[model samples]
Target chain A: PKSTYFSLSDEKRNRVYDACLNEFQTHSFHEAKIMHIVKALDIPRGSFYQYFEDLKDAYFYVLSQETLEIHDLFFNLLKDNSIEESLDKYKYLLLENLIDSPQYKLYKYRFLDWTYELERDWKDNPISQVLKSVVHNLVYRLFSENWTEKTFIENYDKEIKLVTEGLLNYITDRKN
Target chain B: PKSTYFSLSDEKRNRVYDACLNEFQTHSFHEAKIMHIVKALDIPRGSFYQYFEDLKDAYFYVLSQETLEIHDLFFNLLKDNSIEESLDKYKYLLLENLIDSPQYKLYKYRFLDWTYELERDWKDNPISQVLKSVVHNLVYRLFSENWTEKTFIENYDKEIKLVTEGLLNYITDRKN
Candidate 1:
């Protein structure tokens, strides 16, 4: 929070953001290094320190700034479409905008890993409480099931139908 | 498997198991030592090797033996109870069996830690697939929602009813 990261001019912040994300997406958290980030970007070591306390702090910033797009994506889905159309189109949009995008490796990891630190940070946010879990649960399944187009078509309807309807259907109906 | 551990008498095996569990419960996997285990049990250095190859083997054994019971508790709930009954009873059983047991510190950590080795091992077991995510979802909620008995009773039925009836009800309603 003490960091002057946001005070930078638009061009400066964008480069730093890209450099940080590039470091993380290319390497596992354990393997990624502050020195590597500095060297990779040709940025001054002092500049990084001035903007952030440490690598974890910068990594946290990257995740917040770039990695989590759950709310945006949800509202994007909710836009001017029937629930049926939204559910049907969801996976294609996710696959294209997320993994098939330029930063596929980076975003893929948001699916692959979690920590108590990030988990609490995301879930404790009132807006993220319901949607974050549902998104995470679905992403967790996608990897574990080793899904692909064939697999997606086979199970997509059943899976998404249940998730959407179940979450929205209001338990009062069946529980009654 | 190379360890001669199984050949030991029940009393001997239990003492060794307790020593290993104690060492891990007191220390992180990297910090834990076979020296500590052998020392605590007053067993000779040679005996630790005859029983296990190294500290990782011993640590893995301890986690496998103790860390996994949380999953079994969930399925055991499904046997004779209604969906609502299962969710309501889950916390009491968890509070009593896990958090209240003699080895409370050891069990408290079921909610506390994870490692790369343990993550891969759990996923490699097909049987563990469903249980890991469900348990994680609940733990995520525990800390995020700041659960208490009052909160659990207030929301457990509504939350899990949607989850359980969603899937089973869907394999019937939507799939059919």
Candidate 2:
């Protein structure tokens, strides 16, 4: 976190960021190299350290930049508009800017290439907890609704209680 | 893919597998080592390569053994149940088996710790497509439904259709 890289101007930062992202987007974590990033950027090798600790640091940064998750793009809608008004606000932002474009693969790879440490950190996420709770209910809904009635009937109350948490509580939580 | 230990007697295999599982369950992937497993199992260091290609081989095998997804557990329910009936039924099994039990944190880490190549393989999964469909819907709900209704109306049909694919195919095309 203390790297001098943060001191770079936005233009310099993006130059380094783009070069590193290009490398990480294709190569395995082990396969990506600062040498390649520095080479392509036409910068001296030591200049790489001006921005990040190592390949892992640069990789983590590149990944952290790709936060195109639904919870990230959608839930914030509650703050400004009715559900009716907000129906398609962020999808284009997400679609053209993310999955429907070149970013789709890199984002997919981030999910795929996740390791135990990344998983642990994902729980203590960069986003708010209320949105995460809402997302959890949705997980419950999708997983619970696909089963046979007999199986569901036996566990109906329990399942209902978990996913049926009100949207109001989430908005209230966001307000606070 | 070709572990030497698969040829070992079931009894010997369990002993090695148990030791590795215990390590993985607590430690990050980077921390789980062949040396620790062999040391705990009172086996020679050579006993490890006799079973696995490396620590990662042992770790991956242990994770594959712990699929722990609900769609995985309620497999046959697809024939008898509607997709709606199945949403929340057997989380108890996953809640207890994978998350509530000793493996909870480890499972959280699994979602985080994936890779691009690994994401590709999750498609063509041995599980039936219906169950996979249920899982895809769950992803859709979490990622999409959190948005305000007002914002979602614009691209509503388009978004819903895109998210309705099987998790494997969703991931597969994302890779391609």
Candidate 3:
């Protein structure tokens, strides 16, 4: 975003941000167009560029504002608590931010429409990367499965428990 | 595909199939065009529809021919082996089919371009579903990370171990 975007009054900046957010929540970055945002804001086409270099820049702006540092929440908790306790507590934070907010649509588009271009700039450690993938899969199922809050938590507990305990614990005692 | 497609000689049928496969391998289902296939095959544009209902039909035919029953491989192994052994062996099967063949490019596009419409008809049990998601995330990283076969296997082992032994085994003992 440009300095001009920041110079707007709080009310006008939020209005522009909301229009951009609405665009991304409904359309993937690939499908989103600047024309729609400009029309929605009733701003001139040239004015859109004054705020953003391109549609990608606008997308980055919306994502920065709407998305959470979900992985960091788990990492931060892990410093003081056991993995099991951290994961158990992480479930509610996920629900509150992901399922309980309008940001849910933003996330739904992010997961389904994601491409390698998006992943390239993002970097992380191995453990966090693996955990991020698992959490993403869980959230994807939450939307695709049309899971209620209870159902989402139930599946989360089972999968997290599975990750915490080896598969050996689940298998019956079958000795040769 | 229609009966007319089946009526062609083996060589001609394969030629048409290959052309369709080429389009899908290079372009996602949304981007693939029948015109490209017809031009490549030197067939009339009308004949393309005679063989398959539409572009989506051609995409499905290519997918049906090139994809694998990867989930069944693990379930079949689970019947007679420990979970650890089954997962260990499953690693090789993933490599041979996913990475070690010409089908690798096809699988690459499938994973990256996939949408919920593609998943709607597909159904599976709970255990298989979870396994599929994990495997998908792994393959996705394999492409994005530009991992070698050795790199892929190493990461796979770590992740599968994480899934198997639970995170509890990795953390050191600290007195309460």
lDDT of 2 by residue, B41-75 (tens): 99898877877777767777777786555555666
Candidate 3, what DockQ? 0.45
Please report the TM-score between candidate 1 and the true structure: 0.66
Better of 1 and 2 by lDDT: 1
Q: TM-scores across all candidates?
A: 0.66, 0.53, 0.84
By lDDT, the candidates rank as: 3, 1, 2
Residue lDDT tens for model 3, A49-87: 888888888888788877876777788889989777889
lDDT of 3 at A123: 39
Q: Which digits, one per residue and each the tens of the lDDT, describe model 3 over residues B35-79?
A: 899999999999988999888777877778888767777789889
- lDDT digits (tens) for residues B1-176 of candidate 1: 24489988899999988888888778755456778889999989998889887777777777676654766786788797854576667767765654446655555444544433346665322213322444455554554455765554444444444454453353355541
lDDT of 2 by residue, A1-176 (tens): 22577877899887888888789778756557778998999999987876676677777777777545656566577478643244235434434444346675565445435454554445222113222433333333323344333433333233222222221221234421
Please report the candidate that would top TM-score against the real structure: 3
Write down the lDDT of every candidate, Cα atoms only. Answer: 0.61, 0.52, 0.78
* Winner by TM-score between candidate 3 and candidate 2: 3
Worst 10 residues of 2 chain A by lDDT: A161-170
Task: Tell me the docking grade of candidate 3.
Answer: acceptable
Clashing pairs in 3: A164-B166, A166-B164
**Interface RMSD for each of the candidates:** 6.6, 14.5, 2.4
